[PDB]
Amino acid sequence: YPKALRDEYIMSKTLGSEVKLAFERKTCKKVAIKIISKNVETEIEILKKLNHPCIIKIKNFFDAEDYYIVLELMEGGELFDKVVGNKRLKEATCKLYFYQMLLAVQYLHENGIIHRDLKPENVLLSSQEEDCLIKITDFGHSKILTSLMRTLCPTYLAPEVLVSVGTAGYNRAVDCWSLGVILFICLSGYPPFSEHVSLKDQITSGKYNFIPEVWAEVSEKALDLVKKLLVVDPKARFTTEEALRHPWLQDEDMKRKFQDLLSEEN
Amino acid sequence: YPKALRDEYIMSKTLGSEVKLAFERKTCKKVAIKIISKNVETEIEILKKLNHPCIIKIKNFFDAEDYYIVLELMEGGELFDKVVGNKRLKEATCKLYFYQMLLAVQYLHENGIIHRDLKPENVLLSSQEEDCLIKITDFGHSKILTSLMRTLCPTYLAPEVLVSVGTAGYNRAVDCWSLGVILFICLSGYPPFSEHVSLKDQITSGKYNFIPEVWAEVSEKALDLVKKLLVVDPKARFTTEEALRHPWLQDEDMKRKFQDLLSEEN
Ligand SMILES: NC1=N/C(=C2/CCNC(=O)c3[nH]ccc32)C(=O)N1
Ligand SMILES: NC1=N/C(=C2/CCNC(=O)c3[nH]ccc32)C(=O)N1
Ligand SMILES: [Mg+2]
Ligand SMILES: [Mg+2]
Prior knowledge:
The PDB classes it as transferase. 2 copies of one chain form a homodimer. By secondary structure, the first copy, chain A, is of the alpha+beta class. Chain A is 39% helix and 16% strand. In chain A, strand 4 and strand 5 form a beta hairpin. In chain A, helix 4 runs antiparallel to helix 7, helix 4 packs across helix 12 and helix 7 packs antiparallel against helix 10. The first copy, chain A, is globular and about 55 Å long. At the A-B interface, helix 6, helix 7 and helix 8 of A face helix 6, helix 7 and helix 8 of B.
């Protein structure tokens, strides 16, 4: 560990891989430190610009030799750990986590950011209590969306750079697909696509693995949302706005719980 | 002009827009200095890594305030100036310039670089003599092609990021299209697509404006090559290798002339 950092942080045990637990040397507050060895520039620039209760905040950053990104500690661990092993969550807490997931992602998209790696390993939990805040992480591969304008306003441009352009404004739709895969998993405890017909075909065709026996402890509305995010056509697929107006999220009690949790955090 | 530069270069008259003529203060050698006001990082990194008789070499670079890129001076001007105004070049010198253009672009592509802005304004001429060397410029918008590997080696990936992948290895084909538009122009003196049916449709359909009266001072082989580069399907379109084996470039006298010109330059 570089002198500047060890000078501020007492390093400590691994939280998984590398993310370490660490305590601020002056206050003894706990924090987490993501170590990346040698578009981290991109990650940092993003994490500094963004302010949202469901998006992880950066607290510090060291560059000498490896990158160390200092972050909020999330006592609840990654959501991955709640879903491994056909485990699976109670419908009402799926609802609670997914509301938050949709608010976060809506917020990236309104700020011209596509996350591009949404998966349960990248959704963190505030606390060990079932009802809690979730913060999304890992902007290593995100894209910040002016530049249509220069290509279009011409006579030399290949016809496929052209065609390609009428696609502009739909890349964010890969995040919505990803959220639908997360939701599917949370609701059911198994993955919709899986090598357990080949992965590629499965996904392009859009035919997720649907198990009636499993989905039967799940409401019609919830399943209706997943089906609407698992649409292969990016144009027709649900956006985060649509998913937030969907009847399943019209739940003022989960809405209630959430504002309650925002408040506890302040 | 920043002190470090004026200290080395006597600035002078405009060569077009900004590219200035400039003389090295110690030797009085002439050079050109491209001024970009505030992916220049990208341009420089590229120009430093590349060594090819038909690709412009960088000689120096200043960053304080505006970017100044110091380059070879090309006494012949841009090729644009030879083709403005239904002007048009003698077939045998089209051949000579286009050989060189294909060698340069082949060389970018073998080095994983796509140029992405080939146009006559970006082909420079060594000398004011009809038979001369051409160097390609302007890497402002180029792409340096590992990363398929991480997306593919999965269960969360939108079906269109997938589909999209079987496109990998064909982006270079936008350079070949562009070269075919350049060739068309050189051979005929008019543009194949033009607002003189709308630009977009023209290009996507691939129906260039073909004038029999004009093309009649042009050989069948030459026109055959253009048709083969103006193909809308990127898979079927000619690569630089194919175009170099095409009967029109099987000319050992132009081949002769060229090596002659390489030699004069040393
Ligand atoms: N996937 C991912 N996990 C991250 C962190 C860093 C953020 N905070 C954490 O508490 C944490 N617990 C275990 C891993 C983490 C992270 O930043 N990306
Ligand atoms: N399009 C383009 N023109 C360039 C240069 C810079 C390279 N050298 C030249 O002599 C020159 N003459 C007039 C313009 C130029 C250039 O670098 N890009
Ligand atoms: Mg990642
Ligand atoms: Mg340019």
